[PDB]
């Protein structure tokens, strides 16, 4: 009809992509679960419009020039939202709005700063993507209102430094992207005792000195967990590379292969006998 209605057994997907719009079509199926709204002309959108569709689980709002989100109505059963590639300059607030949100992709926008309570009512957010925006510095207590967080993307921004205790509270974090940023050091005690399977930290100019000794210590202990971002490749080129993280982003100087001569170690008890 107005769009391409997919009739798969599980969910009622409808595709309204690339059809030149500026608002929603009036009459959609009531049982709509997935709705694709890419490549349209939506420079302001009101979530309240979706409130008739009690069956909606997914909504793509990518690549459609968006600059303002009227955070307005409650979307109970929404779980994923894609807002990538748009032109937002700040980030909306969604505490009461949608509890069941798990996926939050806010990549390739024009964000520049983060609030304090930047996310609330988001205890069910698993994944989160900030890829390629213009962020410099993160707010404390950031990831706190999201405990269930598994994945987290911060690639390619102009990140310089990070809050100690940022990760703390994330017992299910498994993937973690910081490639192509401008990170320079890690605060002592940053990852903690959590096991981190996946972590990409290449493409950052690192200052290898006495301050990075915790990070090298972690890189020694976690070298089977350090990788490099690749998109269209075979899994077999997806192997562990600890050498990629480099002092001053020099391919000839790794970080885990760094002596640190001159750095004071923490008077022997057993020698004064």
């Amino acid at each position: 009809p107005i769009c391409e209605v997919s009739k798969v057994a599980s969910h009622l997907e409808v595709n309204c992509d690339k059809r030149q719009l500026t608002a929603l079509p009036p009459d959609l199926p009531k049982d709509t679960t997935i709705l694709h709204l890419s490549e349209n002309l939506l420079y302001t959108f009101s979530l309240a419009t979706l409130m008739p569709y009690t069956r909606l689980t997914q909504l793509n709002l990518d690549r459609c020039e968006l600059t303002k989100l009227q955070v307005d109505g409650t979307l109970p059963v929404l779980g994923t939202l894609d807002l990538s590639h748009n032109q937002l300059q700040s980030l909306p607030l969604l505490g009461q709005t949608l509890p069941a949100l798990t996926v939050l992709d806010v990549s390739f926008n024009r964000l520049t700063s983060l609030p304090l309570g930047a996310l609330r009512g988001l205890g069910e957010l698993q994944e989160l993507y900030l890829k390629g925006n213009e962020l410099k510095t993160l707010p404390p207590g950031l990831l706190t209102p999201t405990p269930k967080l598994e994945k987290l993307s911060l690639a390619n921004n102009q990140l310089t430094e990070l809050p100690a205790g940022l990760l703390n509270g994330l017992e299910n974090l498994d993937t973690l992207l910081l490639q192509e940023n401008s990170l320079y050091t890690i605060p002592k005690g940053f990852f903690g005792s959590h096991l981190l399977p996946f972590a990409f930290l290449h493409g950052n100019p690192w200052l290898c000195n006495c301050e990075i000794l915790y990070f090298r210590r972690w890189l020694q202990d976690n070298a089977e967990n350090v990788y490099v971002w690749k998109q269209g490749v075979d899994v077999k080129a997806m192997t562990s590379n600890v050498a990629s993280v480099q002092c001053d982003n020099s391919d000839k100087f790794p970080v885990y292969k760094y002596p640190g001569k001159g750095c004071p170690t923490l008077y022997p008890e057993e020698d004064t006998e």
Partner: protein, 130 residues
Amino acid sequence: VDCLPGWSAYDQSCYRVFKLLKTWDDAEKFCTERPKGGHLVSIESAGERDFVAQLVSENKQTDNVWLGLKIQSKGQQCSTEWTDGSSVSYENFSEYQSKKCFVLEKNTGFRTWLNLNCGSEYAFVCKSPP
């Protein structure tokens, strides 16, 4: 019951809580490095276990503490067969993802024994005769 300064006297041995980070392997050589010899500690009875959690509490419960126990493994892990019944003929672990050498659990109150990796950094406690 007659022991060194910086040390403490219990039955069958002198004891001393060593306030330094070191591996399990290196802490064994530092235990033998005390002149009166010995190894890391060993726990067998109730009164003995209750005794030792109190000495580390005098060191204000800094972190987890090495002890002498260690998994003596043929290969890497400690299970003969998979769930489908087939035998473990293949191992793909990492030495950091190995838990062989045990440690006093700091949470439960230094009353239990927990295996971790052997190259990690914890405090230890040598067990030395009079």
